[PDB]
Design a binder for this molecule. Structure first.
Ligand SMILES: [Zn+2]
Ligand SMILES: [Zn+2]
Ligand SMILES: [Zn+2]
Lengths: 324, 86, 367, 348
């Protein structure tokens, strides 16, 4: 059985690799490439476990990894080497961002032209997510928007549930920036749902954006009622957020302002809520004003000023804007 | 290590801790009643409407909601009834 | 129709389920496409779908798939050939859960590597899959796991709670598998067994070979009575076996039933030898193909005139409104399902009693 | 001291063959140590539990002897019983998945003895520790329902309505399927009490009135439910629903036995209620219903103020603020606020 044969061969390979001495190993692995491929279906298990044993030396041995991936690309052209190759793209690229590896990564252009002008939904989604991440790192909004509209066409794919949640988050941010909150809410809900099952750092970050989008939706239905978001209700990072949600609905002013003032170092830090806070503190005031002047026929402006905790001029401006 | 195992592969299945959460529209527990059936004293069917997504509501609650907007109240997805239980 | 038998052919092509080692090249996949065409021509696709789902669950939960790209493309091929959307969604969810489980297992192995548990960190694998798609039953059965595995379940539960707090993990002991090492005199041969079989074999391990009765085994393993007997059938009636590991049965009989108080005992000098010549480093798989996991026509006539009543009441309606009104009306009768309502929906549209709006895909018009 | 039990237990531990005389000698030791000069029995039992917890004993007679010792434990004064229960709960903690049956009974006994001492906080925490969802054992629905109702009642008696509601929401899931009518009645009573504790007075009144018509419930409990319904309806906010509830209660014949019939008959006919005919009422109000609304006014003299304002709307065409506050005890200011709040909700 040749399977255990090359298993023992790669075993020594790594035994000698602990004693460095690289050129012998590489050349042996190169000459055993074709034999291992033809003899037994290699695909994922053994080569990926070798890469798992090898990434522990990501610092240094960079040339060794580079030549390994070069020979894997130009020798394993038969069969599909792409799926783990975008993993190499994420490893090497997006570590130094704008390095020319980003320009080089477009050698999948033949598959791009084969698909666009399908059935390769997974690879297209993965490359779109990678390009979205790169262009978000470089802060190119037009390119992100173009990528999202181009990705919206694919509806016959089965992706890993982190690739999908990145393009969904990008689309939600684009919708929030443009001004369409209706799609932003559902996009951020989808991004949070996909992040919950797989992921860790950007998990209690899409929930906050989802909350903000729901609060910019003229209220209605507490986001902390679905089974996906309830467990994170008492999280210390999101306690201010759920307090804000509870304050917005059941219209009141003092609690909202107190929450905004107290959590100055936990809410008014990111550039996404620090800018949209002006739309808030105005919708709640408008709702309170509408609810207050319902049973009156002749009301005093200073009374409204006292109720809304703002001066006379702002009350007059708000009334004029509402009437117009 | 005689008469002992060597390699073990464990398989477990996860599920949500709380299945029926409160109805978002009415804020009162979903599997009790709605606001009007209890008052009018016919609150014995009042059956929940578990949908395709996983969101549960009252039939009386969602009957008024669907007329205006025909999407799920929470995740804004397409609303089709997957299973109704009582 | 053939149904399940045809599904067996798929089990012989997409993966090495059991005797499916006869694989030549990718051209067999093309033959599978022809089988899909048969699925289009034949009727009663529910049994075929159930068999395909069971085969996929058996193959994925054991990691015995011959190819991975073919299995992934099988979902798209089945969707193109025509099948219920629920099965496709369940298959997609199962594939996504299997993909996430690899990362979860890698994280568990990389994080918990100092407590030393009981076995090495490179020998324990954890696969957590969503119970809403990969399972249907919800019954828990005790297995009385050994002390070696008594320190591994709590660690996995703690890791899952720390990483994904908010969900409860219910361990399924029927689908778990493992490898144990025997010391039966002449040859030490590894044996692949499930949880119940492992418990049954380890019950008679605290006192050499000796001999135990059925009542003692039932009281020790604490299994669910009759199911325990089924486990014994796996260890006494292994097909194509020269000599079973537990070569005992007392009063002969058959492994199917009538165990009564038979005194089963392990054979210390059992002739469990591969090729009947020197079991120096043999390995035997004992799991096998287990994969343990108002009449209709008079009832379907109820709802069609209910839909037609809703339509004759109001001409303009949407899909969600139609579902809400239908389920509002039919609460006094049986609780409607999703498949029945859909079946009635295209039965109505095919009879041209209603018109599907062109501008809106969901809006319906009465006649 | 007399610590010789440990050596003989260790000597018996390394026995080669399985036997039953160990249980007999354990029973003999315990029964001869029941009548002991001091706390030597407690130390002997602690050493027994420590030696028994170890996995070296096969788990086919360990469980039976453990549950036998647990069932023999309550025949003992509770001072040592609490300590031994805590000790065995701590000792079983490292391996719980094996002994998932004795832990439940031990925690139930500990909660019972804690409740018997008028301690509604520690008993709830002890009962919470029972794994009813994340456990390898399959408990029956009745057991889970009873445990949930017990925990909810314990939390309610500790003046913590949030936890009681949280643990009654789960019992509501299993209410619809369990066939025990007594359990359903107990769940209904607990839910009504929880609703009453949440200051949702009209819903609690409706639930109590509905429960008062159950034939299975004994007559005195029915009268108590009717009295609670009357109190909740009186304390409820003014409106059409409260008026309908008041009319329904006034239609009831058996309402004359209650001492609050005069207040009901005055409130039914939209009559203004003063403080002279209320002083005896606040005496019989439950303490949880006498809490203030953080505005200096209790619950009673806010519902009564709203009722007075609603009744005055039928006998007036237009009223100034000073006159409205004169007959409502409001000096000048909050009468307008109360009137504006009673509108925009359809009440007036
Ligand atoms: Zn509702
Ligand atoms: Zn209802
Ligand atoms: Zn939904």
């Amino acid at each position: 059985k040749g399977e255990w044969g090359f298993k023992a061969l790669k075993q020594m390979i790594k035994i000698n690799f602990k004693l460095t001495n690289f050129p012998e190993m590489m050349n042996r692995y190169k000459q055993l490439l074709t034999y291992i491929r033809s003899a037994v279906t290699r695909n994922y298990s053994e080569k990926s476990i070798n890469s798992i044993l090898d990434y522990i030396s990501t610092s240094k041995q960079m040339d060794l990894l580079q030549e390994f991936y070069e020979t894997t690309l130009e020798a394993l052209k038969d069969a599909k080497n792409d799926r783990l190759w975008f993993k190499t793209n994420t490893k090497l690229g997006k570590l130094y961002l704008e390095r020319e590896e980003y320009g080089k990564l477009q050698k999948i252009l033949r598959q791009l032209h084969q698909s666009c002008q399908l059935k390769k939904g997974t690879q297209l989604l993965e490359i779109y997510a990678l390009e979205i991440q790169m262009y978000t790192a470089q802060k190119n909004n037009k390119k992100l928007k173009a990528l999202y509209e181009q990705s919206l066409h694919i509806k016959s794919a089965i992706p890993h549930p982190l690739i999908m949640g990145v393009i969904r988050e990008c689309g939600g941010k684009m919708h929030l920036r443009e001004g369409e909150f209706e799609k932003a809410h559902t996009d951020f809900f989808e991004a949070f749902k996909n992040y919950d099952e797989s992921g860790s750092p950007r998990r209690t970050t899409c929930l906050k954006y989802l909350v903000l989008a729901n609060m910019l939706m003229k209220s209605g239905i507490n986001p902390f009622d679905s089974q996906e978001a309830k467990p994170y209700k008492n999280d210390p990072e999101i306690l201010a957020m759920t307090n804000l949600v509870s304050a917005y609905q059941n219209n009141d002013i003092t609690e909202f302002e107190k929450i905004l003032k107290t959590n100055h170092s936990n809410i008014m830090d990111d550039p996404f809520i620090r800018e949209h806070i002006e739309e808030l503190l105005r919708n709640i005031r408008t709702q309170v004003l509408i609810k207050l002047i319902k049973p009156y026929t002749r009301i005093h402006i200073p009374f409204i000023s006292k109720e809304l905790n703002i001066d006379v001029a702002d009350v007059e401006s708000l009334l004029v804007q509402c009437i117009l | 290590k005689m008469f002992s195992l060597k390699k073990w592969n464990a398989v477990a299945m996860w599920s949500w801790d709380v299945e029926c959460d409160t109805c978002a529209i009415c804020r009162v527990q979903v599997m009790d009643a709605c606001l009007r059936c209890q008052a009018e004293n016919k609150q014995e069917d009042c059956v929940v409407v578990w949908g395709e997504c996983n969101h549960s509501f009252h039939n009386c609650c969602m009957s008024l909601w669907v007329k205006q907007n025909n999407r799920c109240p929470l995740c804004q997805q397409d609303w089709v009834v997957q299973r109704i239980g009582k | 129709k053939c149904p399940e038998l045809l599904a067996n052919y798929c089990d012989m092509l997409l993966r090495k389920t059991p005797l499916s080692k006869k694989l030549t090249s990718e051209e067999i996949e093309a033959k599978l496409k022809e089988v899909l065409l048969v699925l289009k021509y034949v009727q009663n696709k529910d049994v075929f779908m159930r068999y395909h789902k069971a085969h996929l669950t058996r193959r994925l939960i054991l990691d015995i798939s011959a190819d991975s790209e073919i299995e992934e493309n099988m979902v798209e091929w089945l969707r193109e050939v025509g099948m219920p959307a629920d099965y496709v969604n369940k298959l997609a969810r199962m594939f996504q859960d299997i993909k996430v489980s690899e990362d979860l297992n890698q994280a568990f192995k990389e994080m918990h590597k100092n407590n030393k548990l009981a076995l090495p960190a490179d020998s324990v694998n954890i696969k957590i899959l969503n119970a809403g798609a990969w399972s249907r039953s919800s019954e828990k059965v005790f297995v009385s796991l050994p002390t070696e595995l008594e320190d591994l379940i709590p660690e996995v539960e703690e890791f899952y709670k720390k990483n994904h707090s908010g969900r409860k993990l219910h361990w399924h002991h029927l689908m778990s598998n493992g490898i144990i090492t025997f010391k039966n005199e002449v040859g030490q041969y590894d044996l692949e067994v499930t949880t119940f079989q492992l418990a049954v074999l380890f019950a008679w391990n605290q006192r050499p070979r000796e001999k135990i009765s059925f009542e003692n085994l039932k009281l020790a393993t604490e299994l669910p009575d009759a199911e325990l007997r089924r486990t014994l059938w796996s260890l006494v009636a292994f097909p194509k076996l020269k000599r079973q590991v537990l070569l005992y049965e007392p009063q002969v009989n058959s492994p199917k039933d009538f165990t009564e108080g038979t005194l089963f005992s392990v054979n210390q000098e059992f002739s469990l030898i591969k090729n009947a010549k020197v079991q120096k480093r043999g390995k035997i798989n004992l799991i096998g193909r287990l994969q343990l996991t108002g009449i209709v026509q008079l009832r379907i006539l109820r709802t069609q005139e209910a839909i037609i009543q809703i339509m004759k009441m109001r001409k303009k309606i949407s899909n969600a409104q139609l579902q809400t009104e239908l389920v509002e009306i039919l609460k006094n009768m049986f609780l409607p399902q999703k498949k029945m309502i859909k079946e009635q929906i295209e039965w109505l549209i095919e009879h041209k009693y209603i018109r599907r709006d062109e501008s809106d895909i969901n809006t319906f018009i009465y006649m | 001291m007399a610590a010789a039990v440990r050596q003989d237990l260790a000597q018996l531990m390394n026995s080669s063959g399985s036997h039953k005389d160990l249980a007999g000698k354990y029973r003999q030791i315990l029964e001869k140590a029941i009548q002991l000069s001091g706390a030597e029995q407690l130390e002997a039992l602690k050493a027994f539990v420590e030696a028994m917890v170890n996995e070296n004993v096969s788990l086919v007679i360990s469980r039976q002897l453990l549950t036998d010792f647990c069932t023999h434990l309550p025949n003992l004064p509770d001072s040592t019983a609490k300590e031994i229960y805590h000790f065995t709960l701590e000792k079983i903690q490292p391996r719980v998945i094996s002994f998932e049956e004795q832990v439940a009974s031990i925690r139930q006994h500990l909660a019972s003895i804690y409740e018997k001492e008028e301690d509604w906080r520690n008993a709830a925490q002890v009962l919470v520790g029972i794994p009813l969802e994340t456990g390898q054992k399959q408990y029956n629905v009745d057991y889970k329902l009873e445990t949930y109702l017990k925990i909810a009642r314990l939390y309610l008696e500790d003046d913590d309505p949030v936890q009681a509601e949280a643990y009654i929401n789960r019992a509501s899931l299993l209410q619809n399927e369990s066939t025990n009518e007594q359990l359903q009645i107990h769940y209904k009573v607990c839910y009504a009490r929880v609703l009453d504790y949440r200051r949702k007075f009209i819903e609690a009144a409706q639930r109590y009135n509905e429960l008062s018509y159950k034939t299975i419930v004994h007559e005195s409990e029915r009268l108590e439910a009717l009295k609670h319904a009357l109190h909740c309806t009186i304390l409820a906010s003014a409106g059409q629903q409260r008026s309908r509830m008041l009319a329904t209660l006034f239609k009831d014949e058996r309402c004359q036995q209650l001492a609050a019939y005069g207040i009901l008959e005055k409130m039914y006919l939209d009559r203004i209620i003063r403080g002279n005919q209320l002083q005896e009422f606040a005496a019989m109000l439950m303490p949880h219903q006498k809490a203030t609304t953080a505005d200096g006014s209790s619950i009673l003299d806010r519902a009564v103020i709203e009722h007075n304002l609603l009744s005055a709307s039928k006998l007036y065409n237009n009223i100034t603020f000073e006159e409205l506050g004169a007959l409502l005890e409001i000096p000048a200011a909050k009468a307008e606020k109360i009137a504006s709040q009673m509108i925009t909700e359809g009440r007036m």
